[PDB]
Design a protein around this ligand. Structure first.
Ligand SMILES: C=CCCn1c(C)cnc1C(=O)O
Ligand SMILES: [Zn+2]
Ligand SMILES: [Zn+2]
Length: 231
């Protein structure tokens, strides 16, 4: 089955195939006094691999490349980051050391600078507006307006109808929006509908923290963020 947070010690990384040549990676990190899981994506780009989001910090991101060479054996050559929180750019510096071309949105790149996290080298052009999308390697990058954070992207793999939600989609088991400091609640619901519009065929949805699902996840996220307001 899928990995849960308890099964993964801090600083180990597991890979979970989703469709052909599309894995996800799970690892665990501690934020204040707990240890949460986080998810990322791995996609085959011809003879190289494209990494959607770091593990969650340097040590983990290190083990990720370790796992990948063991399990996949193709090299990770580029890497795109969903937003600026440590669970997405923690380990950039390691990747860049490991020879991996690190990419990210401009907005995201600035927000990382300001908040003092690692900063991906290259800027992603033409994702600046709501609904924009640019085709990066074997995936489409899509910007759907503010949600979990004003910059958050999502990643669709057209070949496999996989949609990478990033921290902007929750899981079912998750019910409490909870920590929403840098999150624009007022726009998020629309922003998810922007997704359900553009990627409506999507037959594999993946959140930033937890077990995958289908297009149901979107709707479950809207409610959960809705009832953050009326309660
Ligand atoms: C399960 C995550 C709780 C809040 N959080 C952390 C610590 C990192 N990312 C998030 C999130 O909500 O996306
Ligand atoms: Zn985040
Ligand atoms: Zn997160």
């Amino acid at each position: 089955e899928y990995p849960t947070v308890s099964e993964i010690p801090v600083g180990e990384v597991r890979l979970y195939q989703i469709a052909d040549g599309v894995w996800s990676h799970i690892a665990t990190q501690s934020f204040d006094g707990a240890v949460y899981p986080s998810n990322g994506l791995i996609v085959r780009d011809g003879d190289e691999l494209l990494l959607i989001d770091t593990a969650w910090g340097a040590k983990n991101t290190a083990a990720l490349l370790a796992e990948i060479e063991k399990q996949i054996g193709l090299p990770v050559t580029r890497a795109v980051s969903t937003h600026f929180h440590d669970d997405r750019v923690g380990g950039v510096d390691v990747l860049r050391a490991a020879g991996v071309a690190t990419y990210a949105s401009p907005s995201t790149r600035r927000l990382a600078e300001v908040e003092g996290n690692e900063i991906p080298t290259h800027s992603l052009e033409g994702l600046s507006s709501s609904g924009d999308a640019v085709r990066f390697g074997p995936v489409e990058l899509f910007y759907p307006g503010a949600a979990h954070s004003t910059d958050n992207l999502v990643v669709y793999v057209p070949s496999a109808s996989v949609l990478y939600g990033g921290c902007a989609i929750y899981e079912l088991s998750r019910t409490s929006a909870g920590n929403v400091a840098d999150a624009d609640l007022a726009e998020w619901p629309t922003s998810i509908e922007r997704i359900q519009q553009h990627y409506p065929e999507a037959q594999f949805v993946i959140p930033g923290h937890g077990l995958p699902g289908g297009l149901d996840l979107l709707k479950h996220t809207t409610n959960v963020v809705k009832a953050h307001t009326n309660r």
